[PDB]
Amino acid sequence: SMTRIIGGVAGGRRIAVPPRGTTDRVRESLFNIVTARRDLTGLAVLDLYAGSGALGLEALSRGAASVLFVESDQRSAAVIARNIEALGLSGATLRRGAVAAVVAAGTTSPVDLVLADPPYNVDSADVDAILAALGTNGWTREGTVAVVERATTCAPLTWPEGWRRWPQRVYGDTRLELAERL
């Protein structure tokens, strides 16, 4: 199936989606809220469990300087690559590997925005551990925003550390949790 980039320079561009997660309103609203509050121009972005890459690609469309897509499924990785090609925007790097393992090994270059849409088989308590790791392993700096998209049937997250939560949103059967690093 296909969806569309909502906004920015590539707004309206079709992108492929891998074997179903299983919205426009969630993605539209996510970027509404983030950009309401942060200028995306020049920002570094991490897109975890990227799947189709729709989130990080939306960020790139809206002027992010770079997006690292992290995705474990090789067919999903292929879709992300095809989608980066379709958008034709610079700044995208694709890292195909186990997402928690990549996050574990850490980085020396923080990002400004973390987007994560973890699949149903990923327990919220394990996502909690990833959120801790983002703080401690070089992925974030003061002011980094994290957004996680989960089905409402999933247990809510436990934010670590010096994270300040933004108001929680629900759209249909999807919950968005957002917070920024203190």
UniProtKB/TrEMBL annotation:
Q: Which SUPFAM superfamilies does the record cross-reference, listed alphabetically?
A: S-adenosyl-L-methionine-dependent methyltransferases
Q: Which InterPro entries match?
A: DNA_methylase_N6_adenine_CS (IPR002052), RNA_MeTrfase_RsmD (IPR004398), SAM-dependent_MTases_sf (IPR029063)
Q: What Gene3D superfamilies does the record tag this protein with?
A: Vaccinia Virus protein VP39
- One family name in Pfam for this protein: Cons_hypoth95
GO MF term (any one): methyltransferase activity
Annotated keywords = Methyltransferase, Transferase
The answer, when asked if Ion transport is one of the entry's keywords, is no
Domain of life assignment? Bacteria
**What does the record list as GO biological process?**
rRNA methylation
UniProt entry tagged with the keyword Metal-binding: no
Question: PANTHER family of this UniProt entry?
Answer: METHYLTRANSFERASE
Q: What is this protein called?
A: 16S rRNA (Guanine(966)-N(2))-methyltransferase RsmD
What does the record give as the organism's lineage?
Answer: Bacteria, Bacillati, Actinomycetota, Actinomycetes, Mycobacteriales
